[PDB]
Design a protein around this ligand. Structure first.
Ligand code: HEM
Ligand code: KUV
Length: 464
């Protein structure tokens, strides 16, 4: 038959906003244990459908994805990339698909293809060596360092080369104001931002929204700066990065602006996400050092100690694909996808969802469903390993964090390689640790990309 999505009772004026609280991915998980995979809330006057459960989500984003491929018109998204973002604008028709395919292409052309030896491979090692040299310096003087300030540059340098052909040192000024001065949570985009549903909070004293409205103007400046320095030195046959790749196309509807700001779409996604991933990894390595050995033990068995890991080795290091798989899962640092929206009156598991309905996708619920994982709160990479030491290719596919369907991540490949290549080169020549007896807050901080309370105590050691 056909029924309306269930849900709990919400306040008439504000809705369930007082129930979501500060960690919606948790609040909405406990709901899904009561109302299931399809449930309905209201934030202010706007109703929202929260999709949970692995198979329920697969049914909507992939099989019926053409019905769920849209984005709601939220206030915060109008501020990103001049309200014309490929990823966040309400545009989802042909105009958008054209921009995605140009994005996937510019990546495959300056990320995967060979360098006249892989593009991504050459860069990651480039900044990995630098990163190591740079961390040694802090062990010399201060003795202790915060791993984030330096990982973010080293990560940013990579995505920044694939896009603008430039690299910046770890103590630059313009870049730390760009990708690090923010040193905040990233929450005004995290699904459930009250300003998107309570119109008044946009005009009231809101510094988080002022630090955010400003950080975007700064980002959109760095784009124009590079687009011009690239058009000042542009050769119609010699393409040097995704930036050049886009310019070349503006010559061949699609405003010149909706094509160029795409390189910003890759750049803002790149540095933010992969950085967090590597940061969390260090936090785990430092917290549970058995995994620090069992991941080194593999690294000294497959390849040696007089060999820098190449990108061809990710296949034959299963314990590391496990650690990656677990760090993605246990943290689930992308707990919600970017909110979706129904493109037409559709149905899911017997429920009616009308056209235009804001929908949340609770990736955090899948990665911590006790129905699937035995002990979801424990960090145990060993849960992905078959009795013969290999990766269980059906459970690794149940770790959801890049999305599904027509809107999934276009840099999943590049994120998985980059996160494995960065980790390999370090730990082979490095023993991260933290002195016993200090506070390390492993608690996550809600946001689009969840972060952690920065830690200034890490100590890198050179191996035997
Ligand atoms: C661990 C790292 C990463 C994670 C967890 C991640 C996750 C995601 C998620 C959950 C979405 C949206 C899902 C949805 O809309 O339903 C997304 C979209 C996107 N991602 Fe990533 N991503 C990562 C790295 C990257 C990288 C390295 C790039 C590019 C260099 C990238 C580029 C994009 C873009 C352009 C979109 C927009 C999707 C669209 O507009 O259709 N991501 N990513
Ligand atoms: C392409 N692109 N250009 C600009 C962005 N935005 C930011 O980096 C960003 N800064 C944020 C922030 C902050 F730094 C400090 C204080 C408060 C804040 F709110 S919140 C957010 N989203 C993006 N993406 C985001 C990452 C990825 N996961 C997406 F899926 C796709 C693209």
């Amino acid at each position: 038959g056909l029924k309306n999505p269930p849900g709990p009772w919400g306040w008439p004026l504000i809705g369930h906003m007082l129930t979501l609280g500060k960690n919606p991915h948790l609040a909405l998980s406990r709901m899904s244990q009561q109302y299931g995979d399809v449930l309905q809330i209201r934030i202010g006057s706007t109703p929202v459908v929260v999709l949970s459960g692995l198979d329920t989500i697969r049914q909507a984003l992939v099989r019926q994805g053409d019905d769920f491929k849209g984005r709601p018109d939220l206030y915060t998204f109008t501020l990103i990339s001049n309200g014309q973002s490929m990823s966040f604008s309400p545009d989802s028709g042909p105009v958008w698909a054209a921009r995605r395919r140009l994005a996937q292409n510019g990546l495959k052309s300056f990320s995967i293809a060979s360098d006249p030896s892989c593009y991504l491979e050459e860069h990651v090692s480039k900044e990995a060596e630098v990163l190591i040299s740079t961390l040694q310096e802090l062990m010399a003087g201060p003795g202790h360092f915060n791993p984030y300030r330096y990982v973010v540059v080293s990560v940013t340098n990579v995505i920044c080369a694939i896009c603008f052909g430039r690299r910046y040192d770890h103590n630059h000024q313009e870049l730390l104001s760009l990708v690090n001065l923010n040193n905040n949570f990233g929450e005004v985009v995290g699904s459930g931002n009250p300003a998107d549903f309570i119109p008044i909070l946009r005009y009231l004293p809101n510094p988080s929204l002022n630090a955010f409205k400003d950080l975007n103007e700064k980002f959109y400046s760095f784009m124009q700066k590079m687009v011009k320095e690239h058009y000042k030195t542009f050769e119609k046959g010699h393409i040097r990065d995704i930036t050049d790749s886009l310019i070349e196309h503006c010559q061949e509807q699609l405003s010149d602006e909706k094509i160029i700001n795409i390189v910003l779409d890759l750049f803002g996604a790149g540095f933010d996400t992969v950085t967090t991933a590597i940061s969390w990894s260090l936090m785990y390595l430092v917290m549970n050092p058995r995994v620090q050995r069992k991941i080194q033990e593999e690294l000294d068995t497959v390849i040696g100690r007089s060999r820098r890991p190449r990108l061809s080795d990710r296949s034959h290091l299963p314990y590391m694909e496990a650690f990656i798989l677990e760090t993605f899962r246990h943290s689930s640092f992308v707990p919600f996808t970017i909110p979706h929206s129904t493109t037409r009156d559709t149905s899911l598991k017997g429920f009616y969802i009308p056209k235009g309905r804001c929908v949340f996708v609770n990736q955090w619920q899948i990665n911590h469903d006790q129905k699937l994982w035995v002990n979801p709160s424990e960090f145990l990479p060993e849960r992905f390993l078959t009795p013969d030491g290999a990766i269980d290719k059906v459970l690794s596919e149940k770790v959801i964090i890049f999305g599904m369907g027509k809107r999934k991540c276009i840099g999943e490949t590049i994120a998985r390689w980059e996160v494995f290549l960065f980790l390999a080169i370090l730990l082979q020549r490095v023993e991260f640790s933290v002195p016993l007896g200090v506070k390390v807050d492993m608690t996550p901080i809600y946001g689009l990309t969840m972060k952690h309370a920065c830690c200034e105590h890490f100590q890198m050691q050179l191996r035997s």
